Amino acid sequence: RNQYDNDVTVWSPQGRIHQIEYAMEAVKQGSATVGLKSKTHAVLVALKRAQSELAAHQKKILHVDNHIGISIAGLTADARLLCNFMRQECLDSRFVFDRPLPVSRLVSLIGSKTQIPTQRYGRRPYGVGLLIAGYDDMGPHIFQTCPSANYFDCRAMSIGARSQSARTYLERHMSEFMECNLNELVKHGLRALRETLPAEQDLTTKNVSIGIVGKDLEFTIYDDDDVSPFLEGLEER
Amino acid sequence: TTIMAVQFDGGVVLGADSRTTTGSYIANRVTDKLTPIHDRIFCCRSGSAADTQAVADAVTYQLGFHSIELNEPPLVHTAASLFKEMCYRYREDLMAGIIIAGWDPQEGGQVYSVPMGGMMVRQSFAIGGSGSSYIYGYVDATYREGMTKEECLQFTANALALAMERDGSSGGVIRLAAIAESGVERQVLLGDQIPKFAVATLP
Amino acid sequence: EYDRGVNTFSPEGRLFQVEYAIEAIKLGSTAIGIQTSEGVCLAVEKRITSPLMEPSSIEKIVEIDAHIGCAMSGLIADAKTLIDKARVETQNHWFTYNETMTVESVTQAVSNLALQFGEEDADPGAMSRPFGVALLFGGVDEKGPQLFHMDPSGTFVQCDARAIGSASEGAQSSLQEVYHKSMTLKEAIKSSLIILKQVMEEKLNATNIELATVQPGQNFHMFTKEELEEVIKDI
Amino acid sequence: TGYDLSASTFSPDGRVFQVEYAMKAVENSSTAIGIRCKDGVVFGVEKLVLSKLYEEGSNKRLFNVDRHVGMAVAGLLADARSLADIAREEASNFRSNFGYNIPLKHLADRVAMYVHAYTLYSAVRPFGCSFMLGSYSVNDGAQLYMIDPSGVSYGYWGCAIGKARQAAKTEIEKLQMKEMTCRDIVKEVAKIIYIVHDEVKDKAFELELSWVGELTNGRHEIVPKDIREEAEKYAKESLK
Amino acid sequence: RFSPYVFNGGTILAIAGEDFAIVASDTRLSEGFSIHTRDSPKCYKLTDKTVIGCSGFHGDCLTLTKIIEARLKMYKHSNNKAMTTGAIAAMLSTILYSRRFFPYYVYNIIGGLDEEGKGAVYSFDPVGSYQRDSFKAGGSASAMLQPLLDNQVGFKNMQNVEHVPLSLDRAMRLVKDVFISAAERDVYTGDALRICIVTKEGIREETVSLRKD
Amino acid sequence: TTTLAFKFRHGVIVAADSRATAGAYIASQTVKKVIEINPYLLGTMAGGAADCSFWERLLARQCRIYELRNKERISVAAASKLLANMVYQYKGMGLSMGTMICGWDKRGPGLYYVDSEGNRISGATFSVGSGSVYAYGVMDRGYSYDLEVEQAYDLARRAIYQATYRDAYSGGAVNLYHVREDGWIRVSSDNVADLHEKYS
Amino acid sequence: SIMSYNGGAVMAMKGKNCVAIAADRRFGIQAQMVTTDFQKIFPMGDRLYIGLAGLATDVQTVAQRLKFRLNLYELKEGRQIKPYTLMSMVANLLYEKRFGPYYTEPVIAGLDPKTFKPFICSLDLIGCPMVTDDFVVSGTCAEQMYGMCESLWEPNMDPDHLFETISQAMLNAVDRDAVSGMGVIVHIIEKDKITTRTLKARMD
Amino acid sequence: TQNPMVTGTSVLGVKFEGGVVIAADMLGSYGSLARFRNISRIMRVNNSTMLGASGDYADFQYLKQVLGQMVIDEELLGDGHSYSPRAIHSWLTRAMYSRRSKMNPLWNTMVIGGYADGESFLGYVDMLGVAYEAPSLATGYGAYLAQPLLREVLEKQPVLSQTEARDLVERCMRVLYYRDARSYNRFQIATVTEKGVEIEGPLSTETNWDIAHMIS
Amino acid sequence: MEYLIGIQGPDYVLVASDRVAASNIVQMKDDHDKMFKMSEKILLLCVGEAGDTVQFAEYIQKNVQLYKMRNGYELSPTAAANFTRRNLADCLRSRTPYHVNLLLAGYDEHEGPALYYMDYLAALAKAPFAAHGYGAFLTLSILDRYYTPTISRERAVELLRKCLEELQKRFILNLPTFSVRIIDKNGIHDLDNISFP
Ligand SMILES: CC(C)C[C@@H](C=O)NC(=O)[C@H](CC(C)C)NC(=O)[C@H](CC(C)C)NC(=O)OCc1ccccc1
Numbered sequence A: 001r002n003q004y005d006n007d008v009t010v011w012s013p014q015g016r017i018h019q020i021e022y023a024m025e026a027v028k029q030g031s032a033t034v035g036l037k038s039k040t041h042a043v044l045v046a047l048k049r050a051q052s053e054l055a056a057h058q059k060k061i062l063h064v065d066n067h068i069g070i071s072i073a074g075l076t077a078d079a080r081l082l083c084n085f086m087r088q089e090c091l092d093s094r095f096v097f098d099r100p101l102p103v104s105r106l107v108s109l110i111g112s113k114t115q116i117p118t119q120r121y122g123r124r125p126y127g128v129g130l131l132i133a134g135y136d137d138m139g140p141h142i143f144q145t146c147p148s149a150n151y152f153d154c155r156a157m158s159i160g161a162r163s164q165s166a167r168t169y170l171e172r173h174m175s176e177f178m179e180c181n182l183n184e185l186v187k188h189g190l191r192a193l194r195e196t197l198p199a200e201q202d203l204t205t206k207n208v209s210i211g212i213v214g215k216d217l218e219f220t221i222y223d224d225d226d227v228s229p230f231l232e233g234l235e236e237r
Numbered sequence B: 001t002t003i004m005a006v007q008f009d010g011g012v013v014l015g016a017d018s019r020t021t022t023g024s025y026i027a028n029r030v031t032d033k034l035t036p037i038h039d040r041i042f043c044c045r046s047g048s049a050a051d052t053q054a055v056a057d058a059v060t061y062q063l064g065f066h067s068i069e070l071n072e073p074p075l076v077h078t079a080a081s082l083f084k085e086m087c088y089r090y091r092e093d094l095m096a097g098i099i100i101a102g103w104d105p106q107e108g109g110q111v112y113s114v115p116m117g118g119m120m121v122r123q124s125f126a127i128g129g130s131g132s133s134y135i136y137g138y139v140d141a142t143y144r145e146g147m148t149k150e151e152c153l154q155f156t157a158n159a160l161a162l163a164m165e166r167d168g169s170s171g172g173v174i175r176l177a178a179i180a181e182s183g184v185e186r187q188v189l190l191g192d193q194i195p196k197f198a199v200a201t202l203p
Numbered sequence C: 001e002y003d004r005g006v007n008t009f010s011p012e013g014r015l016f017q018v019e020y021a022i023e024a025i026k027l028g029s030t031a032i033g034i035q036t037s038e039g040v041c042l043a044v045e046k047r048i049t050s051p052l053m054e055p056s057s058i059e060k061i062v063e064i065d066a067h068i069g070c071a072m073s074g075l076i077a078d079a080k081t082l083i084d085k086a087r088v089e090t091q092n093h094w095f096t097y098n099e100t101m102t103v104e105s106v107t108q109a110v111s112n113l114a115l116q117f118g119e120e121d122a123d124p125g126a127m128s129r130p131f132g133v134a135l136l137f138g139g140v141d142e143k144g145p146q147l148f149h150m151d152p153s154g155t156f157v158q159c160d161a162r163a164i165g166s167a168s169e170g171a172q173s174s175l176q177e178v179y180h181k182s183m184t185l186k187e188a189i190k191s192s193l194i195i196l197k198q199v200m201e202e203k204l205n206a207t208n209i210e211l212a213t214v215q216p217g218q219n220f221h222m223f224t225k226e227e228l229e230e231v232i233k234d235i
Numbered sequence D: 001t002g003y004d005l006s007a008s009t010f011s012p013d014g015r016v017f018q019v020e021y022a023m024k025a026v027e028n029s030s031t032a033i034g035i036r037c038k039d040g041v042v043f044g045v046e047k048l049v050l051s052k053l054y055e056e057g058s059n060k061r062l063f064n065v066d067r068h069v070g071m072a073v074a075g076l077l078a079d080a081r082s083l084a085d086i087a088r089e090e091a092s093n094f095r096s097n098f099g100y101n102i103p104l105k106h107l108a109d110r111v112a113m114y115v116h117a118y119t120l121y122s123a124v125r126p127f128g129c130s131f132m133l134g135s136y137s138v139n140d141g142a143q144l145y146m147i148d149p150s151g152v153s154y155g156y157w158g159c160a161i162g163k164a165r166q167a168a169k170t171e172i173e174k175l176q177m178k179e180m181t182c183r184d185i186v187k188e189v190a191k192i193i194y195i196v197h198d199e200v201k202d203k204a205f206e207l208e209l210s211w212v213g214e215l216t217n218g219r220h221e222i223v224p225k226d227i228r229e230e231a232e233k234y235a236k237e238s239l240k
Numbered sequence E: 001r002f003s004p005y006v007f008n009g010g011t012i013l014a015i016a017g018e019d020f021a022i023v024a025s026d027t028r029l030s031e032g033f034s035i036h037t038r039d040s041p042k043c044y045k046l047t048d049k050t051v052i053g054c055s056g057f058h059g060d061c062l063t064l065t066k067i068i069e070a071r072l073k074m075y076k077h078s079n080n081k082a083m084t085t086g087a088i089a090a091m092l093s094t095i096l097y098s099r100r101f102f103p104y105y106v107y108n109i110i111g112g113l114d115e116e117g118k119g120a121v122y123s124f125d126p127v128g129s130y131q132r133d134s135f136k137a138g139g140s141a142s143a144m145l146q147p148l149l150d151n152q153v154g155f156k157n158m159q160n161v162e163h164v165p166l167s168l169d170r171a172m173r174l175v176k177d178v179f180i181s182a183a184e185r186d187v188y189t190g191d192a193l194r195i196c197i198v199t200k201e202g203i204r205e206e207t208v209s210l211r212k213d
Numbered sequence F: 001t002t003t004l005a006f007k008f009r010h011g012v013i014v015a016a017d018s019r020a021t022a023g024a025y026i027a028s029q030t031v032k033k034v035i036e037i038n039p040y041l042l043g044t045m046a047g048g049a050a051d052c053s054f055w056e057r058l059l060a061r062q063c064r065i066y067e068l069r070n071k072e073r074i075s076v077a078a079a080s081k082l083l084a085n086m087v088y089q090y091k092g093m094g095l096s097m098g099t100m101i102c103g104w105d106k107r108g109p110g111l112y113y114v115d116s117e118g119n120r121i122s123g124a125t126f127s128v129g130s131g132s133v134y135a136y137g138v139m140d141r142g143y144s145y146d147l148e149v150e151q152a153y154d155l156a157r158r159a160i161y162q163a164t165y166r167d168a169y170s171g172g173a174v175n176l177y178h179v180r181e182d183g184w185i186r187v188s189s190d191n192v193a194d195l196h197e198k199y200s
Numbered sequence G: 001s002i003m004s005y006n007g008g009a010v011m012a013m014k015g016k017n018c019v020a021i022a023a024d025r026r027f028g029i030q031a032q033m034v035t036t037d038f039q040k041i042f043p044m045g046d047r048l049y050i051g052l053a054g055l056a057t058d059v060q061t062v063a064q065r066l067k068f069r070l071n072l073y074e075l076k077e078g079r080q081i082k083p084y085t086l087m088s089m090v091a092n093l094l095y096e097k098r099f100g101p102y103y104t105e106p107v108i109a110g111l112d113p114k115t116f117k118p119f120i121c122s123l124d125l126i127g128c129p130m131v132t133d134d135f136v137v138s139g140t141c142a143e144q145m146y147g148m149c150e151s152l153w154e155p156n157m158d159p160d161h162l163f164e165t166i167s168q169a170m171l172n173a174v175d176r177d178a179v180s181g182m183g184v185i186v187h188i189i190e191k192d193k194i195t196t197r198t199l200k201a202r203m204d
Numbered sequence H: 001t002q003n004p005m006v007t008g009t010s011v012l013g014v015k016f017e018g019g020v021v022i023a024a025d026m027l028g029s030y031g032s033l034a035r036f037r038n039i040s041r042i043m044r045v046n047n048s049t050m051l052g053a054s055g056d057y058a059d060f061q062y063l064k065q066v067l068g069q070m071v072i073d074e075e076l077l078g079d080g081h082s083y084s085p086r087a088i089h090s091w092l093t094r095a096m097y098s099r100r101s102k103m104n105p106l107w108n109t110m111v112i113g114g115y116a117d118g119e120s121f122l123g124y125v126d127m128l129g130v131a132y133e134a135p136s137l138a139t140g141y142g143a144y145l146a147q148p149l150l151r152e153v154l155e156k157q158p159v160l161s162q163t164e165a166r167d168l169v170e171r172c173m174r175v176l177y178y179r180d181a182r183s184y185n186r187f188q189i190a191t192v193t194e195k196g197v198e199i200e201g202p203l204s205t206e207t208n209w210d211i212a213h214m215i216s
Numbered sequence I: 001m002e003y004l005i006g007i008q009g010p011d012y013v014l015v016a017s018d019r020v021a022a023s024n025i026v027q028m029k030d031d032h033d034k035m036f037k038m039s040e041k042i043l044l045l046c047v048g049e050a051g052d053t054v055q056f057a058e059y060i061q062k063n064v065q066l067y068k069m070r071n072g073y074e075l076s077p078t079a080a081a082n083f084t085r086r087n088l089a090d091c092l093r094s095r096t097p098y099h100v101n102l103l104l105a106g107y108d109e110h111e112g113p114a115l116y117y118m119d120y121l122a123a124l125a126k127a128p129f130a131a132h133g134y135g136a137f138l139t140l141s142i143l144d145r146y147y148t149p150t151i152s153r154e155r156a157v158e159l160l161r162k163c164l165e166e167l168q169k170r171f172i173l174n175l176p177t178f179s180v181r182i183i184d185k186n187g188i189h190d191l192d193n194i195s196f197p
């Protein structure tokens, strides 16, 4: 099956495109990121990973717009290219209509741009998984995007290495998240991110990044000093 | 150039004069300003001869492809919309005013006037060209709703006759066409046949 | 047989060309970059092949701007195009905003150019392969002395201290042992030379080593042979 | 072999394998059924919810291509979303050029030709989605068309696309759709989807219902929840 | 034939102080001898420390403000910091020169706090030339407003006068007095005066009524 | 606008008025016509304010990139040619620019005049602007290569002052710079009003 | 007119088995004569010559461009160009610039390569080709030349007579034009030989 | 449109509590001639927005086609988001300015009236892209004649009842009919409220010609 | 306004140019050289609109230099003149037309001395003696009266001085200093500037 796996254009005789699946594996290799939403706020929690003890952790949360924020898993450069497309599209909505772009409408445009490489020859599926947290007239939204170019609306979703452990936590506590206050909602995400962490590792201000968007709050990324209040109230694993 | 179209129940009557003039010289004294875009759709052409003929040929080709592809008789509104789109896009380039009248199974007899500037309006009676200004009062006073096909044919001929007498550009023979489900019947009125209105007699 | 295209994902999920380009960096000479509150220090191994080559011709450490310098490892020729992009970008930022570009902003811009390679790219002339150079950018901005790492993958990460080159893994273990947050620039320069001397096959000498420093008070300065001799004599 | 690598290569038998491989991807996808009635067309999708985490209404397989037209898709969703965008563009272009709502037979032909272009070249792979377009107009009447990855488009009184198309088609055949009105058919489309679904594997399905017809005044719309709930109740009672 | 530019009127003034910056504008928008609206403020808040006043063809003013806002958002995304008043001044010159062949008909004065916290006023000609000034007036009444500002703020042509540092209260009385005087002698200015004060706390807006006509 | 530059044994003296005028209206009395391209190079601005500022700033960027790429400062001649080539492309499009490029290079002290028309010339003494004619007469009468540094400063101050008196567009203060092998220095900025008392 | 700026007069006449072409030798920017040795008649095919009058730049450019095409044609075809074909080639070159024309009116005098039949032709600035059995005249003094030629020309003139007739017409006609003159050069084309003679003309 | 052809006269807008009312005549005139005497110059963009245009009918008809497609496209998405009256106004300002910059302007002045989220929006977009929002709006000769009457009543009493606003618009239309050569008796009134946009059919203002006898 | 003159003798070409550069009513420079050395034995003198003169001449000079480097032999004066005429004529109908009047002087070992006159319109004429600018109208008559084809180099300078002396006596414009150069088998040689003051 070596011939089928080499190019995106080739269809395997089993009806599958191997190159798209290989790109999806790249998102799995990246660090775990968990995003969940309540009635009032939507949050992104990121396990920043350090190449060396000396090295600082890579950025995992980025500001697309005042009402939109993204968590990146997979190849960082592909994410930055996708983020620039999203930043330009949201700005174009503000310039033309003087309104924030509906978060759902942006995800549809991202899906279209990601799909075109998969069909054409000499192109690669973008190897990134993005969690989009945004607040629009409809309310808080959490969306997951894949190299397959399929985008899904999620009450909560976790992407990256050991994401399944975070997903199990989210499924059990899904009912509590909607009515929870912002501090409770962020804490639920921190616990889910901890499940991904190996038992030896512990959540710390340096390795944790939190992004919050809400009815009265523009997307804010909380730094290591800023994450300390959210992490201060916690329970031992 | 005077071009007129009047809608009748189940049909449309289209009329035009026959004069093409460069300055005060008549190049053609028998010009046909009624062009068949499709089997039951015709256009009356006013303005530059070259611009009108080119636009009419392009619409006939486009409407012909459209009808063959859809395997259905074309709509008058579709023909008018194609003319409006070309006229508006090149409004600065083309000095052309066209009245599109035809029969569709769905909406029967329809007259649409696309004036210079590419605007489309459906009107019970439409008049166009240099002679149109002289006959505006006659058309408004004479037109009566419920006019029969013969009454519309008389109405169009009487109006065109008045415009041709008072307009230098309008003249020659009156060409009339009537479009209905049965088909298109075309007649030419000349000399005695052209309606005559008494001139003032005070030497 | 080069059957796979330049943009092909591995069964594991990593682009084949990017991984091969990361292997190319291992061939490159070791460069030690340390960030200290007093200043950021960049050091590199010239690796002169023969006595005949003039030593000054090798230029591993280059000045992106007065406040920003970069040390390079891997294929030097690939780096020149990236270095030119950085210099033009810093000058453009001055013209448009009348301010110095932050080191992170410069590293992000060069990093963006790293993955822009395509076989079916519209431009008749476009990069066909990933860049094969690793760049350490060290500079002082409003945030303070800062050092950043650029990889052929296009990932940019701020580093307190890092080594890029053939002996990077061995040097990194040594750097982690000797790195303290309170270290002064003079201590960092001495530590960088000590790690470089151990990793370098040739004995350390003023000609075979290039060292440069950026401090908030002074613009990027490359140590002169006399200046290099004093630090090496202390060893 | 090597005869199956490109869409620009015919097999010694005369078959382009890459297009066949694309059709297989549609067969893997969950079933979508469209039934045309005297009043208009009704559509149903056996949407499968992979995870409880996904919010309800995510990954919709029913789209509104135009005010009067609706699309039911089975296959790669990303390709189907791209085809929906092409369908929306074609209808918009027709309205601008000819001034009237695009006839469905024409929309199906134009979109099918776009799907066909992919099958002819090595540079671009064929689309992996099959879709049904449904519309009602007083002059046109109810019309249902289905387009395969090959690009063939044929009108159908009733159609099923997906894993259980063969099973659904026998159940669809039993219904006398031409006599029945849309309100009656909405119960039947729910019944066929529930019967076709496999409880043992590919469980946790959700039913998406859409209709265009006299009841909707010729505007394709998602079936109202009150009617949808009644239809699901009929399907559950019938399954017993 | 078609004329691409129309004069929509309006006058703007910005005064810089040791700890404050005040940008003021009339609210009247007028085409020819007719008043389009009595409430169209010409002051727009670029950032927490910066307010830009734009007077001239209104269509050019609206587009330029929209372009500046996008550039500010783009800078924050790329540089991870909000643009300083001086940087906005340098960027605005480049945007204006980009349209040198088809110029924007807008007179722009930027008023904002500098990095040290001292007040800074930047004045721009339509093509793009910019300079930093303690006080500048732009628009239809710029010629009327500027001479009093030289006499009082600059103490020019006055001998044996103490050069007291400008006070927020004194500067605000001067801004009201100059605009009231201009409304009396210039047809374009009038209706109301929008005063925006930039300080470390934030931007504070005050409106004082001016003669309707 | 009066701008004057001359070359003498000690170096190059660059001086300018500070008045910017919109038609009759005097927009500014503090405009800085002389721009510092690099620590060893200066550019003088005359005619259109935006045109001169944009193009001289673009020359400075090109000179900075040249220094980084070639590891040496650009020649006065090379900088002057670069400005001329960039302006020539826009010839006939209405750019109005009069500029003097003054600096010290390995070749020696250098003075060049570049204009929107495209003339580029090197001279011992040049004056550019509306008041250039008035400045030229005073400078020509008192100019010598042998002038002492202090006398040279006075000649530049006097020529600008006399020009401001005759020319309506010239005005404000005279800003004087001296280019030396070490680099340029801003010798002084003197308001014409104060100079008027001293000269008279 | 643009044509009058540099001036110039060229004419061709047909004889029994000979053709003749003559041109003024003055090159002038307007009222000032820069040179008296300017070339307006260019050899094309040994017995085929083209005389160009109009803007001096255009006269030089068209001769240079025509030679490029003719040299390529002769190499590929393997044969000397026929006189009619040269008229077609020059007409194509002039028409290519119809919207912005070269300001030159070409006159062609030649003998057929095999038959040796006399051929004379004239073309307009935009490439219209006119072929005549007697004389073709182009230039600032065209009306004067037409008057002299119509009266002087006679059929079946011998080469010596053709030379005298073309010379008398050119000399008297350039005498009545201020911007043409300063000498005239006459070429007599015969199958056996080419005779080139410079006439004595008033210099003023 | 460097040169306008068939054109429409003034369109008037007034804001009342709970909605906006815009009134336009039904005449398209080629120069002096009243060529088309039954044309609607008011368009219902969506449930919350209506647009009235003065200027080339062809350019207005083109805008109606483009605006209508954009609204149809949004409805297809069904994301629960619909364009606000302000959003349509922002789009028009960008579209008019872009054409002005290209030097191929759309020769139209448009009044956009909408009611959304318990607020009433009235906006003006010019051919050159000049745009503003005001309580009372008028275009063409309406600015010179009708706007002074509308502004005086509004300045004295800021909030107007729907009935009072229709009464004011009818008085203004009569004033325009008397003093504008391009005015026509038949006109359409469009009102936007929480319920939606309603356009009334041809309406004629009664006229008093008593002054004609007084001329003697 | 600017002045160029060329006198050609049996074994040499004598060329002179005005040394004044002027903007408006003021002569900014009195040392300007309008002579550009295309090759060891070729000089191109250019007078015309500002900017166009330097841009065209420098481009021709650099292209002529490239020919020597690429082929190892310099162009003939006739070839260089034909190369300038083609480039100027090609640019004449182009959006950017150069307003340049050029005089080309060179000595070729095989064909001897050459002087070429080219107008802005791009007409190339080989002339025994030629001049450019308003000064030519006064100067050319003197040259026609006193020029003999066998004139010696010393006599050529005497003729040149007479032409320049007339310009001082009758020309409205002030052209005090003229640069003089000669081209012969040895090569281009600078001659002392003729300054009337
Ligand atoms: C069916 C009609 C559109 C044909 C007919 C009736 O209007 N056309 C016309 O009456 C119009 C008159 C209008 C231009 C004022 N005439 C025309 O369109 C042209 C006149 C030319 C000067 C362009 N008719 C014509 O015969 O053109 C001959 C011509 C064409 C080019 C140059 C010189 C002469």
Ligand SMILES: CC(C)C[C@@H](C=O)NC(=O)[C@H](CC(C)C)NC(=O)[C@H](CC(C)C)NC(=O)OCc1ccccc1
Binding pocket: E103, E125, E126, E127, E129, F001, F019, F020, F021, F022, F023, F027, F028, F031, F032, F033, F045, F046, F047, F048, F049, F050, F052, F129, F130, F169
């Ligand atoms: C003040 C220096 C920077 C330049 C100096 C040099 O001569 N003078 C100038 O630049 C001239 C004065 C000159 C015309 C006599 N001044 C100007 O050019 C002024 C700049 C300030 C005075 C407002 N610009 C101006 O008034 O018009 C600029 C413009 C250009 C195009 C469209 C609209 C407006």
